[PDB]
mmCIF file of all heavy atoms in Angstrom:
data_model
loop_
_atom_site.group_PDB
_atom_site.id
_atom_site.type_symbol
_atom_site.label_atom_id
_atom_site.label_comp_id
_atom_site.label_asym_id
_atom_site.label_seq_id
_atom_site.Cartn_x
_atom_site.Cartn_y
_atom_site.Cartn_z
ATOM 1 N N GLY P 50 -82.657 46.883 50.254
ATOM 2 C CA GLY P 50 -83.139 45.808 51.115
ATOM 3 C C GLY P 50 -83.243 44.405 50.538
ATOM 4 O O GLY P 50 -83.688 43.503 51.244
ATOM 5 N N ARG P 51 -82.813 44.204 49.270
ATOM 6 C CA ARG P 51 -82.820 42.915 48.562
ATOM 7 C C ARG P 51 -81.409 42.657 48.051
ATOM 8 O O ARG P 51 -80.831 43.564 47.435
ATOM 9 C CB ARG P 51 -83.747 42.962 47.321
ATOM 10 C CG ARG P 51 -85.195 43.316 47.599
ATOM 11 C CD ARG P 51 -85.524 44.751 47.248
ATOM 12 N NE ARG P 51 -86.775 45.168 47.883
ATOM 13 C CZ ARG P 51 -87.383 46.329 47.667
ATOM 14 N NH1 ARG P 51 -86.873 47.204 46.810
ATOM 15 N NH2 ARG P 51 -88.519 46.614 48.290
ATOM 16 N N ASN P 52 -80.860 41.426 48.261
ATOM 17 C CA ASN P 52 -79.528 41.053 47.757
ATOM 18 C C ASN P 52 -78.487 42.158 48.071
ATOM 19 O O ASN P 52 -78.405 42.610 49.219
ATOM 20 C CB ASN P 52 -79.593 40.790 46.240
ATOM 21 C CG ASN P 52 -80.848 40.086 45.776
ATOM 22 O OD1 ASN P 52 -81.037 38.898 46.037
ATOM 23 N ND2 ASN P 52 -81.719 40.807 45.058
ATOM 24 N N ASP P 53 -77.728 42.597 47.047
ATOM 25 C CA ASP P 53 -76.778 43.702 47.138
ATOM 26 C C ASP P 53 -77.261 44.854 46.209
ATOM 27 O O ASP P 53 -76.451 45.632 45.700
ATOM 28 C CB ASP P 53 -75.321 43.235 46.862
ATOM 29 C CG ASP P 53 -74.969 42.724 45.462
ATOM 30 O OD1 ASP P 53 -75.901 42.432 44.675
ATOM 31 O OD2 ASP P 53 -73.760 42.531 45.187
ATOM 32 N N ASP P 54 -78.608 44.943 46.012
ATOM 33 C CA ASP P 54 -79.319 45.932 45.192
ATOM 34 C C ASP P 54 -79.296 47.328 45.800
ATOM 35 O O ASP P 54 -79.793 47.512 46.913
ATOM 36 C CB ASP P 54 -80.802 45.534 44.983
ATOM 37 C CG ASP P 54 -81.140 44.354 44.083
ATOM 38 O OD1 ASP P 54 -80.224 43.581 43.747
ATOM 39 O OD2 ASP P 54 -82.348 44.173 43.769
ATOM 40 N N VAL P 55 -78.784 48.318 45.036
ATOM 41 C CA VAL P 55 -78.711 49.753 45.414
ATOM 42 C C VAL P 55 -79.369 50.625 44.348
ATOM 43 O O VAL P 55 -79.418 50.236 43.189
ATOM 44 C CB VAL P 55 -77.260 50.252 45.745
ATOM 45 C CG1 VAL P 55 -76.646 49.445 46.893
ATOM 46 C CG2 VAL P 55 -76.344 50.258 44.513
ATOM 47 N N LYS P 56 -79.827 51.811 44.723
ATOM 48 C CA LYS P 56 -80.448 52.770 43.798
ATOM 49 C C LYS P 56 -79.890 54.185 44.034
ATOM 50 O O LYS P 56 -79.562 54.510 45.176
ATOM 51 C CB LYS P 56 -81.979 52.774 43.952
ATOM 52 C CG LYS P 56 -82.672 51.664 43.166
ATOM 53 C CD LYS P 56 -84.116 52.019 42.867
ATOM 54 C CE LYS P 56 -84.956 50.815 42.572
ATOM 55 N NZ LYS P 56 -86.333 50.972 43.111
ATOM 56 N N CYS P 57 -79.746 55.021 42.957
ATOM 57 C CA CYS P 57 -79.294 56.409 43.090
ATOM 58 C C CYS P 57 -80.508 57.270 43.403
ATOM 59 O O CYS P 57 -81.477 57.236 42.656
ATOM 60 C CB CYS P 57 -78.575 56.903 41.841
ATOM 61 S SG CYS P 57 -78.322 58.705 41.810
ATOM 62 N N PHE P 58 -80.429 58.089 44.474
ATOM 63 C CA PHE P 58 -81.493 58.989 44.924
ATOM 64 C C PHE P 58 -81.972 59.972 43.838
ATOM 65 O O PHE P 58 -83.080 60.507 43.925
ATOM 66 C CB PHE P 58 -81.016 59.770 46.162
ATOM 67 C CG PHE P 58 -80.126 60.965 45.882
ATOM 68 C CD1 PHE P 58 -80.672 62.237 45.694
ATOM 69 C CD2 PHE P 58 -78.743 60.824 45.809
ATOM 70 C CE1 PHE P 58 -79.852 63.334 45.412
ATOM 71 C CE2 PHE P 58 -77.926 61.925 45.528
ATOM 72 C CZ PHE P 58 -78.486 63.169 45.340
ATOM 73 N N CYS P 59 -81.107 60.236 42.851
ATOM 74 C CA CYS P 59 -81.299 61.219 41.786
ATOM 75 C C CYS P 59 -81.893 60.612 40.490
ATOM 76 O O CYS P 59 -83.025 60.933 40.142
ATOM 77 C CB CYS P 59 -79.977 61.957 41.538
ATOM 78 S SG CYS P 59 -80.022 63.240 40.250
ATOM 79 N N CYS P 60 -81.144 59.733 39.808
ATOM 80 C CA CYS P 60 -81.520 59.123 38.532
ATOM 81 C C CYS P 60 -82.342 57.859 38.626
ATOM 82 O O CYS P 60 -82.702 57.323 37.569
ATOM 83 C CB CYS P 60 -80.282 58.899 37.670
ATOM 84 S SG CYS P 60 -79.205 57.556 38.254
ATOM 85 N N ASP P 61 -82.595 57.341 39.863
ATOM 86 C CA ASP P 61 -83.344 56.100 40.130
ATOM 87 C C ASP P 61 -82.667 54.858 39.496
ATOM 88 O O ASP P 61 -83.260 53.787 39.398
ATOM 89 C CB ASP P 61 -84.837 56.230 39.724
ATOM 90 C CG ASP P 61 -85.774 55.147 40.260
ATOM 91 O OD1 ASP P 61 -85.564 54.685 41.411
ATOM 92 O OD2 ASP P 61 -86.737 54.788 39.547
ATOM 93 N N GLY P 62 -81.420 55.015 39.099
ATOM 94 C CA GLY P 62 -80.671 53.930 38.502
ATOM 95 C C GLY P 62 -80.200 52.940 39.536
ATOM 96 O O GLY P 62 -79.571 53.323 40.528
ATOM 97 N N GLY P 63 -80.489 51.673 39.273
ATOM 98 C CA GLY P 63 -80.139 50.562 40.145
ATOM 99 C C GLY P 63 -78.967 49.724 39.687
ATOM 100 O O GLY P 63 -78.831 49.430 38.506
ATOM 101 N N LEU P 64 -78.138 49.288 40.639
ATOM 102 C CA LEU P 64 -76.976 48.429 40.411
ATOM 103 C C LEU P 64 -76.955 47.280 41.412
ATOM 104 O O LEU P 64 -77.437 47.424 42.552
ATOM 105 C CB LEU P 64 -75.670 49.232 40.517
ATOM 106 C CG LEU P 64 -75.420 50.323 39.478
ATOM 107 C CD1 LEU P 64 -74.267 51.173 39.901
ATOM 108 C CD2 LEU P 64 -75.172 49.743 38.092
ATOM 109 N N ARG P 65 -76.386 46.139 40.997
ATOM 110 C CA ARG P 65 -76.273 44.934 41.839
ATOM 111 C C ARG P 65 -75.074 44.105 41.394
ATOM 112 O O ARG P 65 -74.402 44.509 40.440
ATOM 113 C CB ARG P 65 -77.577 44.103 41.806
ATOM 114 C CG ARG P 65 -78.006 43.630 40.406
ATOM 115 C CD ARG P 65 -78.995 42.483 40.472
ATOM 116 N NE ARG P 65 -80.242 42.893 41.102
ATOM 117 C CZ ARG P 65 -81.360 43.175 40.449
ATOM 118 N NH1 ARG P 65 -81.406 43.080 39.126
ATOM 119 N NH2 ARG P 65 -82.445 43.544 41.112
ATOM 120 N N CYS P 66 -74.822 42.949 42.067
ATOM 121 C CA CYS P 66 -73.724 42.000 41.798
ATOM 122 C C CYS P 66 -72.333 42.613 41.915
ATOM 123 O O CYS P 66 -71.485 42.418 41.031
ATOM 124 C CB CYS P 66 -73.920 41.271 40.469
ATOM 125 S SG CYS P 66 -75.390 40.218 40.421
ATOM 126 N N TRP P 67 -72.108 43.360 43.020
ATOM 127 C CA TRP P 67 -70.845 44.028 43.337
ATOM 128 C C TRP P 67 -69.755 43.001 43.616
ATOM 129 O O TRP P 67 -69.955 42.073 44.411
ATOM 130 C CB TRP P 67 -71.022 44.969 44.534
ATOM 131 C CG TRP P 67 -72.003 46.075 44.287
ATOM 132 C CD1 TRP P 67 -73.327 46.083 44.613
ATOM 133 C CD2 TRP P 67 -71.739 47.326 43.637
ATOM 134 N NE1 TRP P 67 -73.903 47.269 44.215
ATOM 135 C CE2 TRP P 67 -72.948 48.053 43.620
ATOM 136 C CE3 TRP P 67 -70.592 47.905 43.059
ATOM 137 C CZ2 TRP P 67 -73.051 49.323 43.024
ATOM 138 C CZ3 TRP P 67 -70.689 49.172 42.497
ATOM 139 C CH2 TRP P 67 -71.905 49.865 42.477
ATOM 140 N N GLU P 68 -68.623 43.145 42.922
ATOM 141 C CA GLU P 68 -67.469 42.258 43.050
ATOM 142 C C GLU P 68 -66.235 43.045 43.505
ATOM 143 O O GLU P 68 -66.259 44.281 43.509
ATOM 144 C CB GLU P 68 -67.176 41.565 41.714
ATOM 145 C CG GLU P 68 -68.241 40.595 41.251
ATOM 146 C CD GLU P 68 -68.068 40.238 39.791
ATOM 147 O OE1 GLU P 68 -68.485 41.046 38.929
ATOM 148 O OE2 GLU P 68 -67.455 39.183 39.512
ATOM 149 N N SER P 69 -65.153 42.324 43.873
ATOM 150 C CA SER P 69 -63.888 42.889 44.331
ATOM 151 C C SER P 69 -63.288 43.816 43.298
ATOM 152 O O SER P 69 -63.138 43.428 42.135
ATOM 153 C CB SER P 69 -62.911 41.782 44.695
ATOM 154 O OG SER P 69 -63.262 41.230 45.953
ATOM 155 N N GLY P 70 -63.007 45.049 43.723
ATOM 156 C CA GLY P 70 -62.417 46.071 42.868
ATOM 157 C C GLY P 70 -63.371 46.988 42.132
ATOM 158 O O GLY P 70 -62.924 48.002 41.586
ATOM 159 N N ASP P 71 -64.688 46.658 42.125
ATOM 160 C CA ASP P 71 -65.740 47.468 41.487
ATOM 161 C C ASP P 71 -65.844 48.834 42.180
ATOM 162 O O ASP P 71 -65.990 48.881 43.402
ATOM 163 C CB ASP P 71 -67.124 46.759 41.539
ATOM 164 C CG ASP P 71 -67.398 45.650 40.531
ATOM 165 O OD1 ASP P 71 -66.665 45.565 39.508
ATOM 166 O OD2 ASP P 71 -68.390 44.907 40.723
ATOM 167 N N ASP P 72 -65.781 49.934 41.403
ATOM 168 C CA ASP P 72 -65.898 51.283 41.954
ATOM 169 C C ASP P 72 -67.292 51.876 41.682
ATOM 170 O O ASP P 72 -67.687 51.999 40.525
ATOM 171 C CB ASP P 72 -64.774 52.205 41.412
ATOM 172 C CG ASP P 72 -64.830 53.642 41.904
ATOM 173 O OD1 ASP P 72 -64.914 53.849 43.143
ATOM 174 O OD2 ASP P 72 -64.746 54.561 41.063
ATOM 175 N N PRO P 73 -68.035 52.276 42.733
ATOM 176 C CA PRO P 73 -69.378 52.862 42.520
ATOM 177 C C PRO P 73 -69.483 54.083 41.587
ATOM 178 O O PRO P 73 -70.487 54.195 40.902
ATOM 179 C CB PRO P 73 -69.855 53.186 43.949
ATOM 180 C CG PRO P 73 -69.088 52.266 44.818
ATOM 181 C CD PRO P 73 -67.739 52.156 44.179
ATOM 182 N N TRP P 74 -68.486 54.999 41.556
ATOM 183 C CA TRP P 74 -68.575 56.174 40.661
ATOM 184 C C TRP P 74 -68.436 55.816 39.183
ATOM 185 O O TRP P 74 -69.144 56.381 38.354
ATOM 186 C CB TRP P 74 -67.539 57.225 41.012
ATOM 187 C CG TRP P 74 -67.948 58.198 42.082
ATOM 188 C CD1 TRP P 74 -67.212 58.571 43.169
ATOM 189 C CD2 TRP P 74 -69.118 59.029 42.083
ATOM 190 N NE1 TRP P 74 -67.862 59.571 43.856
ATOM 191 C CE2 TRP P 74 -69.034 59.869 43.211
ATOM 192 C CE3 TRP P 74 -70.214 59.167 41.218
ATOM 193 C CZ2 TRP P 74 -70.013 60.817 43.507
ATOM 194 C CZ3 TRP P 74 -71.189 60.100 41.518
ATOM 195 C CH2 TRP P 74 -71.088 60.906 42.654
ATOM 196 N N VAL P 75 -67.532 54.868 38.863
ATOM 197 C CA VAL P 75 -67.269 54.351 37.515
ATOM 198 C C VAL P 75 -68.503 53.570 37.010
ATOM 199 O O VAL P 75 -68.877 53.721 35.844
ATOM 200 C CB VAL P 75 -65.976 53.481 37.494
ATOM 201 C CG1 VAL P 75 -65.836 52.698 36.193
ATOM 202 C CG2 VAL P 75 -64.734 54.314 37.773
ATOM 203 N N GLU P 76 -69.126 52.741 37.880
ATOM 204 C CA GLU P 76 -70.311 51.969 37.510
ATOM 205 C C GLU P 76 -71.493 52.893 37.272
ATOM 206 O O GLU P 76 -72.258 52.675 36.337
ATOM 207 C CB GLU P 76 -70.649 50.890 38.550
ATOM 208 C CG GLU P 76 -69.645 49.743 38.635
ATOM 209 C CD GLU P 76 -69.426 48.891 37.403
ATOM 210 O OE1 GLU P 76 -70.370 48.757 36.592
ATOM 211 O OE2 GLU P 76 -68.331 48.296 37.288
ATOM 212 N N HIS P 77 -71.624 53.932 38.093
ATOM 213 C CA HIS P 77 -72.641 54.968 37.947
ATOM 214 C C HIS P 77 -72.496 55.658 36.560
ATOM 215 O O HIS P 77 -73.505 55.884 35.868
ATOM 216 C CB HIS P 77 -72.485 55.994 39.082
ATOM 217 C CG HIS P 77 -73.711 56.792 39.381
ATOM 218 N ND1 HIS P 77 -73.883 57.394 40.613
ATOM 219 C CD2 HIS P 77 -74.804 57.030 38.616
ATOM 220 C CE1 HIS P 77 -75.069 57.980 40.562
ATOM 221 N NE2 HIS P 77 -75.666 57.772 39.382
ATOM 222 N N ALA P 78 -71.231 55.944 36.149
ATOM 223 C CA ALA P 78 -70.869 56.578 34.865
ATOM 224 C C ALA P 78 -71.062 55.674 33.633
ATOM 225 O O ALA P 78 -71.407 56.199 32.570
ATOM 226 C CB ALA P 78 -69.441 57.113 34.912
ATOM 227 N N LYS P 79 -70.818 54.340 33.758
ATOM 228 C CA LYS P 79 -71.008 53.354 32.683
ATOM 229 C C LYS P 79 -72.488 53.247 32.360
ATOM 230 O O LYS P 79 -72.889 53.349 31.184
ATOM 231 C CB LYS P 79 -70.565 51.936 33.137
ATOM 232 C CG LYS P 79 -69.068 51.702 33.127
ATOM 233 C CD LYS P 79 -68.596 50.796 34.259
ATOM 234 C CE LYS P 79 -68.294 49.386 33.824
ATOM 235 N NZ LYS P 79 -69.523 48.685 33.418
ATOM 236 N N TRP P 80 -73.308 53.005 33.426
ATOM 237 C CA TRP P 80 -74.738 52.701 33.258
ATOM 238 C C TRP P 80 -75.715 53.864 33.211
ATOM 239 O O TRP P 80 -76.678 53.808 32.463
ATOM 240 C CB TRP P 80 -75.187 51.608 34.246
ATOM 241 C CG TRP P 80 -74.352 50.355 34.187
ATOM 242 C CD1 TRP P 80 -73.366 49.985 35.056
ATOM 243 C CD2 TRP P 80 -74.366 49.360 33.150
ATOM 244 N NE1 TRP P 80 -72.815 48.784 34.664
ATOM 245 C CE2 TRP P 80 -73.397 48.387 33.489
ATOM 246 C CE3 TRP P 80 -75.127 49.181 31.982
ATOM 247 C CZ2 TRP P 80 -73.161 47.262 32.698
ATOM 248 C CZ3 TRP P 80 -74.900 48.058 31.203
ATOM 249 C CH2 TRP P 80 -73.922 47.118 31.558
ATOM 250 N N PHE P 81 -75.504 54.896 34.034
ATOM 251 C CA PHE P 81 -76.411 56.061 34.114
ATOM 252 C C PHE P 81 -75.647 57.387 33.858
ATOM 253 O O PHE P 81 -75.632 58.251 34.733
ATOM 254 C CB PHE P 81 -77.162 56.068 35.477
ATOM 255 C CG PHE P 81 -77.579 54.687 35.937
ATOM 256 C CD1 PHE P 81 -76.893 54.039 36.959
ATOM 257 C CD2 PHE P 81 -78.592 53.998 35.289
ATOM 258 C CE1 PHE P 81 -77.232 52.746 37.339
ATOM 259 C CE2 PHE P 81 -78.936 52.698 35.677
ATOM 260 C CZ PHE P 81 -78.252 52.084 36.695
ATOM 261 N N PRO P 82 -75.023 57.561 32.650
ATOM 262 C CA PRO P 82 -74.210 58.777 32.386
ATOM 263 C C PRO P 82 -74.902 60.147 32.346
ATOM 264 O O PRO P 82 -74.224 61.169 32.414
ATOM 265 C CB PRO P 82 -73.520 58.453 31.051
ATOM 266 C CG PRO P 82 -74.408 57.462 30.384
ATOM 267 C CD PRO P 82 -74.952 56.622 31.506
ATOM 268 N N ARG P 83 -76.235 60.175 32.217
ATOM 269 C CA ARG P 83 -77.016 61.409 32.160
ATOM 270 C C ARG P 83 -77.583 61.832 33.533
ATOM 271 O O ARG P 83 -78.346 62.806 33.620
ATOM 272 C CB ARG P 83 -78.089 61.331 31.067
ATOM 273 C CG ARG P 83 -77.510 60.988 29.684
ATOM 274 C CD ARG P 83 -78.269 61.608 28.532
ATOM 275 N NE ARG P 83 -79.643 61.125 28.455
ATOM 276 C CZ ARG P 83 -80.588 61.706 27.730
ATOM 277 N NH1 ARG P 83 -80.307 62.773 26.993
ATOM 278 N NH2 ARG P 83 -81.821 61.214 27.720
ATOM 279 N N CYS P 84 -77.167 61.136 34.617
ATOM 280 C CA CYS P 84 -77.566 61.478 35.987
ATOM 281 C C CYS P 84 -76.937 62.830 36.346
ATOM 282 O O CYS P 84 -75.709 62.962 36.310
ATOM 283 C CB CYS P 84 -77.125 60.403 36.972
ATOM 284 S SG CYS P 84 -77.374 60.853 38.708
ATOM 285 N N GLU P 85 -77.792 63.829 36.668
ATOM 286 C CA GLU P 85 -77.433 65.194 37.054
ATOM 287 C C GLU P 85 -76.485 65.220 38.243
ATOM 288 O O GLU P 85 -75.525 65.982 38.218
ATOM 289 C CB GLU P 85 -78.699 65.994 37.342
ATOM 290 C CG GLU P 85 -78.603 67.459 36.960
ATOM 291 C CD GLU P 85 -78.482 67.887 35.503
ATOM 292 O OE1 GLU P 85 -78.635 67.053 34.582
ATOM 293 O OE2 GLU P 85 -78.237 69.094 35.292
ATOM 294 N N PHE P 86 -76.717 64.360 39.263
ATOM 295 C CA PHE P 86 -75.860 64.237 40.456
ATOM 296 C C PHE P 86 -74.449 63.780 40.101
ATOM 297 O O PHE P 86 -73.486 64.390 40.550
ATOM 298 C CB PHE P 86 -76.500 63.297 41.500
ATOM 299 C CG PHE P 86 -75.643 63.013 42.713
ATOM 300 C CD1 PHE P 86 -75.471 63.970 43.702
ATOM 301 C CD2 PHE P 86 -75.019 61.781 42.872
ATOM 302 C CE1 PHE P 86 -74.681 63.703 44.819
ATOM 303 C CE2 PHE P 86 -74.232 61.518 43.998
ATOM 304 C CZ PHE P 86 -74.067 62.478 44.962
ATOM 305 N N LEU P 87 -74.328 62.735 39.269
ATOM 306 C CA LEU P 87 -73.048 62.182 38.819
ATOM 307 C C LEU P 87 -72.236 63.260 38.066
ATOM 308 O O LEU P 87 -71.036 63.419 38.306
ATOM 309 C CB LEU P 87 -73.336 60.959 37.943
ATOM 310 C CG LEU P 87 -72.231 60.438 37.035
ATOM 311 C CD1 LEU P 87 -71.218 59.598 37.805
ATOM 312 C CD2 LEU P 87 -72.825 59.597 35.936
ATOM 313 N N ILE P 88 -72.915 64.019 37.195
ATOM 314 C CA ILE P 88 -72.349 65.119 36.415
ATOM 315 C C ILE P 88 -71.877 66.253 37.328
ATOM 316 O O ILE P 88 -70.788 66.768 37.115
ATOM 317 C CB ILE P 88 -73.299 65.610 35.256
ATOM 318 C CG1 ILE P 88 -73.513 64.536 34.155
ATOM 319 C CG2 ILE P 88 -72.851 66.955 34.655
ATOM 320 C CD1 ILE P 88 -72.431 64.236 33.131
ATOM 321 N N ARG P 89 -72.677 66.641 38.325
ATOM 322 C CA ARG P 89 -72.297 67.719 39.239
ATOM 323 C C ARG P 89 -71.063 67.366 40.083
ATOM 324 O O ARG P 89 -70.221 68.240 40.312
ATOM 325 C CB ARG P 89 -73.475 68.142 40.143
ATOM 326 C CG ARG P 89 -73.366 69.579 40.611
ATOM 327 C CD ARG P 89 -74.175 69.795 41.858
ATOM 328 N NE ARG P 89 -74.719 71.146 41.912
ATOM 329 C CZ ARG P 89 -75.787 71.481 42.625
ATOM 330 N NH1 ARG P 89 -76.434 70.565 43.335
ATOM 331 N NH2 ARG P 89 -76.223 72.732 42.627
ATOM 332 N N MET P 90 -70.965 66.094 40.537
ATOM 333 C CA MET P 90 -69.889 65.608 41.407
ATOM 334 C C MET P 90 -68.612 65.240 40.698
ATOM 335 O O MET P 90 -67.541 65.574 41.198
ATOM 336 C CB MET P 90 -70.343 64.398 42.248
ATOM 337 C CG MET P 90 -71.499 64.675 43.172
ATOM 338 S SD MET P 90 -71.103 65.754 44.544
ATOM 339 C CE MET P 90 -72.324 67.051 44.273
ATOM 340 N N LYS P 91 -68.714 64.493 39.585
ATOM 341 C CA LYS P 91 -67.577 63.948 38.844
ATOM 342 C C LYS P 91 -67.163 64.728 37.610
ATOM 343 O O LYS P 91 -66.005 64.636 37.210
ATOM 344 C CB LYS P 91 -67.805 62.447 38.522
ATOM 345 C CG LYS P 91 -67.874 61.505 39.742
ATOM 346 C CD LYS P 91 -66.646 61.567 40.689
ATOM 347 C CE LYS P 91 -65.451 60.794 40.208
ATOM 348 N NZ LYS P 91 -64.366 60.775 41.228
ATOM 349 N N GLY P 92 -68.101 65.475 37.018
ATOM 350 C CA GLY P 92 -67.867 66.298 35.837
ATOM 351 C C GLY P 92 -68.087 65.565 34.535
ATOM 352 O O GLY P 92 -68.075 64.344 34.515
ATOM 353 N N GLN P 93 -68.231 66.304 33.428
ATOM 354 C CA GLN P 93 -68.452 65.755 32.087
ATOM 355 C C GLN P 93 -67.238 65.001 31.528
ATOM 356 O O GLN P 93 -67.416 64.094 30.723
ATOM 357 C CB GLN P 93 -68.954 66.853 31.118
ATOM 358 C CG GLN P 93 -69.608 66.311 29.835
ATOM 359 C CD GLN P 93 -70.826 65.453 30.100
ATOM 360 O OE1 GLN P 93 -71.803 65.882 30.715
ATOM 361 N NE2 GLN P 93 -70.806 64.230 29.619
ATOM 362 N N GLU P 94 -66.010 65.384 31.926
ATOM 363 C CA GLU P 94 -64.775 64.724 31.471
ATOM 364 C C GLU P 94 -64.714 63.268 31.957
ATOM 365 O O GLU P 94 -64.434 62.376 31.161
ATOM 366 C CB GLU P 94 -63.529 65.496 31.926
ATOM 367 C CG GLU P 94 -63.164 66.692 31.068
ATOM 368 C CD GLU P 94 -61.728 67.151 31.229
ATOM 369 O OE1 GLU P 94 -60.960 66.486 31.963
ATOM 370 O OE2 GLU P 94 -61.364 68.172 30.604
ATOM 371 N N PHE P 95 -64.996 63.035 33.247
ATOM 372 C CA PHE P 95 -64.999 61.706 33.855
ATOM 373 C C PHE P 95 -66.034 60.831 33.156
ATOM 374 O O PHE P 95 -65.677 59.772 32.628
ATOM 375 C CB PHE P 95 -65.279 61.779 35.367
ATOM 376 C CG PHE P 95 -65.361 60.440 36.073
ATOM 377 C CD1 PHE P 95 -64.213 59.812 36.544
ATOM 378 C CD2 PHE P 95 -66.592 59.823 36.294
ATOM 379 C CE1 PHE P 95 -64.295 58.608 37.247
ATOM 380 C CE2 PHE P 95 -66.668 58.591 36.950
ATOM 381 C CZ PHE P 95 -65.521 57.995 37.431
#
């Protein structure tokens, strides 16, 4: 509800300042790599 601020329901990790070409799964993996949801969906290799 503020700016372009988002949060993950699982790891409570927040992201903002989304630009052209930015991928949410890759950003989730850069910043919050120990999120159980990200690991279950994308795997440890990704």
Side-chain angles (χ1 to χ4, degrees):
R51 302 102 197 186
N52 322 289
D53 66 345
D54 289 14
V55 302
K56 277 204 201 144
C57 167
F58 80 91
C59 181
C60 72
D61 194 36
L64 295 168
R65 58 162 64 102
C66 296
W67 298 95
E68 294 165 280
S69 283
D71 281 343
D72 179 51
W74 274 132
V75 168
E76 292 299 331
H77 202 158
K79 282 145 103 292
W80 306 102
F81 321 105
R83 305 212 297 165
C84 172
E85 214 67 9
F86 175 75
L87 163 79
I88 294 284
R89 206 202 212 157
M90 299 291 123
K91 295 305 280 186
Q93 198 60 58
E94 279 199 4
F95 177 86

